[PDB]
Amino acid sequence: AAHGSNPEQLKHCNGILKELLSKKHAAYAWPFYKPVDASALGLHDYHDIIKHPMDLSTVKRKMENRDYRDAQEFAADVRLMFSNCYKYNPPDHDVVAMARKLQDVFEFRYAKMPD
């Protein structure tokens, strides 16, 4: 059910998304900007391990297309992106450290969502 507050909450989500894509966080956000090109990266097992790829450009397209109906649906995709990283890579890999830092940005600001 659409709630009166869903548009306002989606504006907060869009703010978060813009922040995740901003220069401020680019040092650690960059691996998440675009879909993983598994072939290009030689990760020939990526799509056997990751059933539901997700990345920030896809989240942006879904936001622009009004695909997300509520904040929880948005959050689920952003968290799916991080989970994919945690699933595929050894936990000591630099990309996992970058994921944890970007997820910290996400979770702390998501927690400030108006309600």
Ligand SMILES: O=c1[nH]c2ccccc2c2ccccc12
């Ligand atoms: O989860 C990722 N694991 C990787 C492992 C090796 C090289 C690149 C990546 C990568 C690149 C962009 C986005 C996510 C990932």
